[PDB]
Design a binder for this molecule. Structure first.
Ligand SMILES: *[C@@H]1O[C@H](CO)[C@@H](O[C@@H]2O[C@H](CO)[C@@H](O[C@@H]3O[C@H](CO)[C@@H](O)[C@H](O)[C@@H]3O)[C@H](O)[C@H]2NC(C)=O)[C@H](O)[C@H]1NC(C)=O
Ligand SMILES: *[C@@H]1O[C@H](CO)[C@@H](O)[C@H](O)[C@H]1NC(C)=O
Ligand SMILES: *[C@@H]1O[C@H](CO)[C@@H](O)[C@H](O)[C@H]1NC(C)=O
Ligand SMILES: *[C@H]1O[C@H](CO)[C@@H](O)[C@H](O)[C@H]1NC(C)=O
Length: 203
């Protein structure tokens, strides 16, 4: 049947996207590409017609959009505002089918963070608290230890959406360099490399 995929699904700001239309049934009278599920002329961006090949547009922006004979739509410079679901409708008088559910996501390229730790020098069974400073909201922070995934365990505690990380009680094992990392869908940027070394109080 009708399959509509968006390449790339998960788009990036000031980057392009295509509204793929797989197996688009028998050569209809024409197709229509709408925004937002509203099967209303209120939002018609494009209507291509088989039987007499021709491009007529609707009351839709068309500042950067294109419909195709395979019945598909590329979308240039998408923006947070362009985010959301889109719908295509097709018709051949005998029948008009809508079934064009297709949503994708836009993304703000990430920025570099920066840890802040108070006292690289700490005692066994004391506290530490890496905090991954970032100004970007819509986060996926990840904590790295010695350039690999911090296993995250019982004596650790982290909140404010993975921002603040607090290890306690600390133990020599923690003798290493910690780094915080921000994700978006894979448009990432790692933090500095606060090294933390340990001294223990008793002997
Ligand atoms: C519907 O018609 C459009 C015609 O443009 C088809 O979209 C186009 O599909 C190809 C897919 O490969 C895109 O080219 C790709 O380009 C990248 C970079 O050049 C390359 O790495 C890939 O190997 C590939 O060649 C093309 O950009 C894309 N969109 C546009 C706007 O041209 C679509 O495939 C057609 N539907 C079907 C079912 O074929
Ligand atoms: C309709 O076809 C023209 C060329 O005839 C093309 O340049 C234009 O982008 C198409 N309209 C849309 C909304 O894609
Ligand atoms: C780190 O903590 C120890 C506690 O023994 C203290 O002596 C030292 O002054 C602290 N360093 C800073 C920069 O606060
Ligand atoms: C959009 O409105 C329709 C009503 O026809 C509703 O059934 C549908 O759940 C809404 N959006 C999606 C993605 O289904």
């Amino acid at each position: 049947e009708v399959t509509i995929e968006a390449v790339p699904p998960q788009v990036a700001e000031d980057n392009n996207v295509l509204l793929l239309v797989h197996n688009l049934p028998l050569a209809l009278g024409a197709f229509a590409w709408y925004k937002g599920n509203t099967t209303a002329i209120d939002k018609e961006i494009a209507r291509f017609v088989p039987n007499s090949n021709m491009n007529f547009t609707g009351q839709a922006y068309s500042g950067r959009e294109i419909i195709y004979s395979n019945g598909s739509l590329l979308f240039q410079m998408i923006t947070m505002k362009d985010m959301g679901v889109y719908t295509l409708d097709m018709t051949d008088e005998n029948y008009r089918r809508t079934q064009a559910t297709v949503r994708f996501h836009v993304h703000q390229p990430v920025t570099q963070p920066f840890l802040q730790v108070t006292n690289t020098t700490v005692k066994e069974l004391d506290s530490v608290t890496l905090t991954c400073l970032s100004n970007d909201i819509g986060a996926n922070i990840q904590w790295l230890f010695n350039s690999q995934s911090l296993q995250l365990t019982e004596r650790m505690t982290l909140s404010q959406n993975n921002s603040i990380l607090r290890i306690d009680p600390i133990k020599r094992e923690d003798a290493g360099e910690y780094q915080c990392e921000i994700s978006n869908p894979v448009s990432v940027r790692r933090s500095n490399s606060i090294k933390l070394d340990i001294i223990f109080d008793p002997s």
